[PDB]
């Protein structure tokens, strides 16, 4: 053709960016933006952890260099991330039968894992995801070369986890097929299985010899306790199932821009771990010579230092308490407004994001009348909820669902 | 199988890391490491630009947030990078018929460009590279899905650019085939075509309607003048050829760990530019939600501020002068030692890396006897050369080539 890219077509707009722009152009004083993808403080401003600032001050005092990091990443950061994910007294660390490589946050880890599965996981080409899964998950596996399937995870009838349906779908999954399991808060729905349900899922996976691909990105932030959030992964590991974790420190540490993340794979032996490390480095090098330095250095400094680690844990627990308090206040105000609908699932759900279960027509009613901007599926970000405007949101929800 | 990764094999060791480890384990006092991939000062320590430190201090004073950046990247950084690459008075900027997206340094840009070519460049599947090309170039295009070809670039007989052979190979390239052209210092050889040779190559490309994929990663660092280093790209653009630039600020700015880089594509119209921008964002999002923030912010602060830009240009010119002085001193000391070999190609070559043209047996002779560690092909890093040890290196080369 005359032009190289004359056949290139305009890409579809991102709904999240459209919602954000619609909120920005809105002139109503009482407008709210529940489509935000990051945590916010009470005032609604972006929140930077004081532990992060202390780590930055310490690093600036150290006056370190900016040379390239190993292809795998910073050794201290990888070791600290593995210890945090698996626990300080995990048998895996003692045996050393694990590999951890720094990557570009969770998305990068997910991509690296998908590329590794495409290159080496000869058993199957199908990746199973929850039916209401994170949006980027699909494109990542599609670009990496993996076909995608789905299983039931969320039950719209009870607005909760569909345990029986999920068990049946997992049991129907063909053997030796990779499975994706949101470790903690589900990204779009924030519904997590109960520990007994997690044990049942682990037993089914062990019986079917499936491959688990955990995606822990809200560790600590989900409930303020890192051990309880990582309980499912540790249970899977002690059951004898080798799993992969995609850890993202964007939320639990507030390093959204720093792109901090680690991809760890559990192997049977240290020889297998180092072979997987070599192949992972071989895969990583064409994508990027090395991961970034500043964010990983900050994360390693916070994790290794005891006082900084304690302060970071306290801050994360505080943010988790704020999220839970916002959910509880929303439910209480909905009860006060006189709504007879059962909003227990709002308190039951854990994480930033919530489906109140509102119908799309209710969504347009909220957008046009009360100037509340939210996605069509019904997901709202609790971080956007404020103690000042929680009453307004509850009143609007009650009026729409009247 | 019983194990998921029992069939995974140990990856081949990286020769550069092996050379570095061999240098580290060496106990000779007069040992040198010419395999370093980054610039070093006179003392041999890593060099951090004072302009970078001033920018970091200014950013710390600003007390900015760490929220996610747009998928394309920081707007200020992209605009500044495009202006620096194309020139302040470029017609492309006035017409706005360009797209620039931040990426993970040069490697990332190269990958993004290869992915875009795989998805949209329906004309051909073959990418032509110089015969002595950068090592990572191959794996990047192989993983992205592009077949790779080669053309003659370096003439071992004269240790210089093979102009006639390169012209014949380019003319034999099939029409509408993407071509890779190291903009400045050839990574492995540091040989660049003369401006008349660049004009001839541009005329041949325009006649054959080839697609040019420039990889400018040493702008400014090559000779201390950004305009002269970017002269080939500007000539190609004014000739009417739409080209792609993979800019890496790792060297010209010393931000090796910060992973700073931009991929810019020249289009005919602004509509084509924005369509390409949307498709590039669609491609980028699965790989990583957004590029990192700290390095791009530092680069934008340095480029936009006039005093910081002037100081950065002065520092880059100083490092380029140091590299040229090291080359000249090496040639002068080789002449003093009495060697009759023609070492003019050492001064002719521009960039960090040089092929002195030594045979592999001479390489093992240097490694075993004089404890000088270097790659088998003969490439040496001028940044590793020091005013103190340049005489020792010249004496060793003369003794080996005696
Ligand atoms: C499922 C999932 N993956 C990954 C991430 C983190 O993505 P990023 O890599 O952009 O930090 C999140 C955070 O919202 C998430 O919910
Ligand atoms: C040909 C080439 N491409 C790209 C780069 C930049 O690589 P990175 O992305 O690791 O900064 C360099 C720097 O040495 C190079 O020589």
Numbering used by the authors:
A (entry chain C), B (entry chain A): 29 to 430
Q: Could you give the paper's own sentences about this structure?
A:
Specifically, GOT2 transfers an amino group from glutamate to oxaloacetate, yielding aspartate and alpha ketoglutarate. We collected a total of 15,723 single particle cryo-EM projections for this protein class. The BaR methodology allowed us to construct a 2.99 Å resolution structure and identify it as aspartate aminotransferase. The global structure of GOT2 is a homodimer, consisting of two 45-kDa monomers. Each subunit contains three main domains: a large domain that binds the pyridoxal phosphate (PLP) cofactor, a flexible small domain, and a helical bridge domain. The large PLP-binding domain consists of a seven stranded beta sheet core bracketed by sets of α helices. The active site is between the large and small domains and is supported by the large domain of the corresponding subunit. Residues S133, T135, H165, N215, D243, Y246, and K279 from one subunit as well as residues Y96′ and S317′ from the other subunit help form the cofactor and active site–binding cavity. A previous crystal structure also describes a small N-terminal domain (residues 3–14) but our structure did not include this region, likely due to its flexibility.
